[PDB]
Amino acid sequence: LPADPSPTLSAYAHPERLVTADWLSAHMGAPGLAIVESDEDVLLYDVGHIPGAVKIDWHTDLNDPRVRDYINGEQFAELMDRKGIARDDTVVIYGDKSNWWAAYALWVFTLFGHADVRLLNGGRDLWLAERRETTLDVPTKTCTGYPVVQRNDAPIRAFRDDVLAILGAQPLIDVRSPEEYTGKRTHMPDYPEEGALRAGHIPTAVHIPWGKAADESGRFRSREELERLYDFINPDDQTVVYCRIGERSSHTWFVLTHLLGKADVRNYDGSWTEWGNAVRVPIVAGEEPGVV
Amino acid sequence: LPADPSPTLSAYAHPERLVTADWLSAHMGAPGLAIVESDEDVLLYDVGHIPGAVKIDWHTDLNDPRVRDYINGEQFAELMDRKGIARDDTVVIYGDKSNWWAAYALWVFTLFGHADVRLLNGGRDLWLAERRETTLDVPTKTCTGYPVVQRNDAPIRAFRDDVLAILGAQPLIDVRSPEEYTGKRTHMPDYPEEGALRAGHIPTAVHIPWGKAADESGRFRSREELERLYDFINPDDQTVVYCRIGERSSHTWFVLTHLLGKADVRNYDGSWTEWGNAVRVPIVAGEEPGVV
């Protein structure tokens, strides 16, 4: 399928990476279009979803159940087959929590080189706010032949040691709440405080809450607004983003990579649940980025 | 001070490393004797303690507040000075939770090379069970001149990468509950389940609950009982022990090192809170140690 040419999107660096609700509704029933719901709430799809939408749950479908890592290429191909997704399909992903897990799913798809993956602008909440059609019907279509690919981490994923290496050398962006950034908490204010033995941020990390890039409706902010927000980023920068479990940072990862067109942006998916529990890693508290 | 020559202790490999309550009570008021309470419950000392006892709390006194590591040598010397402990003092440590944190404090003292550190056999709970004297009085004596030493981790502490290296090569002992070992839980049954993103044990780890080495009263089991329990350990072994935050494993560390006289035993203090949150480390579930 081709891109949404809506004026809301044309100013973005990769306008092909977002769609509007009107576009999606029009293009339902196209053979090459896959619609995927990805939520924090693993049982939210079961309450009602966009017609034609399949569920891909980040923890249960995309993570290894034993080791802290994603599934392999063989598993991903098996998943695509049973979800009715072909290699050349346009995949449009949406979900709750301001598209956090939808962006995270898009990022995971990118690990496996799926080329055309897009977000529904404003996600599940905008869809419902605008009283658009939902259904309990689950699509039956299955496919075969999705290629078993090499999972390609290096371009878009940063690991603990990678982060340690770039401290002071590259932009590091903490996208969490001020409570988390300053070291008052290890989780968001409205989430049970439990996950890390130390609180703070990674030295040199700058604080830019993920939500600065979206408006009240859940839609991404304009190119102009986003350009200002991340104006400090230069063409030669290899930006790293992080949060607690990588979901809010994948949202920022998406903003930087596709809406602003920045290159070499990596998500440090380990994030604070790794960093704040690791023995002998540098941590700073309070409002200052800190140094070395 | 010299060792407790009580027949209860003589069979142990290092009988100098334990004392009886009768010995301690007799030796109170000796100049070279320091008595330290170390608890899980940071405010338990304040409710009543052994006369002459000072408090050393593992988290607040012995840990760096920002980074996941212990304090440095300069800080330790400052701590010893204000607690009235001299370099040549006999330090007897006791506490709640079956001497877990007392053993952990002993281990930390050993990091800083304090030579004569002992546990009160049966700890705080036996002392109270036998209705021995407590007080609310806090000792006032302070000292100066405790040496600033090099903290010496390598002999007795294992780090994440060290553990990864010895998998299959050396004995690895998981001292947690069966629920934790098999991957049903990430914390003890009677503790809130919250701390790790993955559950299980480290591949090759064998399950020996810390409590097999102590009796109902909190006292350590006999040499004979302990020899049987850890009979599988050979002279050339470099044993590694672990739990969740290193406290139960320091208990086992103490049993192996001082009561059995095993050499090159290390505590992997990072333990499950590190391992079960680290990206891409091997994890196995169920009852089998597992392999490679």
CATH code, A201:
3.40.250.10
CA B251 to chain centre: 4
d(CA B182, CA B185): 8
Coil, strand or helix: which one is A104?
helix
Instruction: Tell whether A195 is within 8 A of chain B (Cβ).
Output: yes
Contact A68 B159 (CB under 8 A): no
Instruction: Tell whether A292 is within 8 A of chain B (Cβ).
Output: no
Q: What is the resolution of this structure in A?
A: 2.1
In a 13 Å sphere around the CA of B130, the CA atoms on its Cβ side amount to 17
Together in a domain, B172 and B112: no
Question: In chain B, how many domains are there?
Answer: 2
Instruction: Tell whether B136 is within 8 A of chain A (Cβ).
Output: no
Instruction: Tell whether B161 is within 8 A of chain A (Cβ).
Output: no
Closest residue in B to A59 (Cα) is B197
Which of B272, B263, B12 is closest to B160 using CA atoms? B272
Query: According to the entry, how was the structure determined?
Result: X-ray
Together in a domain, B58 and B135: yes
Specify the residue for token string 């990206």.
Answer: B279
Annotation says B143 is catalytic: no
Together in a domain, A56 and A141: yes
In a 13 Å sphere around the CA of A179, the CA atoms on its Cβ side amount to 9
Chosen from B58, B60, B62, B67 to mutate, greatest number of chain A CBs within 10 A: B67
Last residue of a domain, which of B153, B187, B222?
Answer: B153
CA B38 to chain centre: 10
Together in a domain, B68 and B121: yes
Residue A271 parent element (H or E) = helix A271-275
Together in a domain, A28 and A2: yes
Together in a domain, B133 and B179: no
Instruction: Tell whether B96 is within 8 A of chain A (Cβ).
Output: no
Together in a domain, B111 and B75: yes
Together in a domain, A148 and A163: no
Together in a domain, A148 and A79: yes
DSSP string computed for A203-232: TT-EE--GGGGB-TTSPBPPHHHHHHHTTT
Tokens of B110: 């050993």
Taking the CA atoms of A37, A40, A44 and A46 in sequence, report the sign of the dihedral they define.
positive
A-B interface: how many C-beta pairs under 8 angstroms?
78
d(CA B116, CA A253): 54
Contact B69 A279 (CB under 8 A): yes
Say which of A68, A160, A198 has its CB closest to residue B197: A68
Alpha-helical runs (H) found in chain B: 21-27, 73-82, 100-111, 123-129, 160-166, 178-182, 223-229, 247-254, 271-275
A243, A245, A265, A283: the catalytic one is A243
A248 is in an annotated binding site: yes
Last residue of a domain, which of A104, A124, A153?
Answer: A153
Together in a domain, A144 and A159: no
Residue B219's alpha-carbon distances to A134, B20, B52, B120, B173, in angstroms, are 65, 10, 22, 9, 21
| R_g (Cα) of chain B, nearest Å | 19
Which domain range does residue B2 map to?
1-153
Together in a domain, A164 and A237: yes
Together in a domain, A135 and A185: no
Number of Cβ within 10 Å of residue A179's Cβ equals 15
Residue A77's alpha-carbon distances to A33, A34, A151, A182, in angstroms, are 17, 15, 11, 41
Number of Cβ within 10 Å of residue B140's Cβ equals 6
Last residue of a domain, which of A99, A121, A153?
Answer: A153
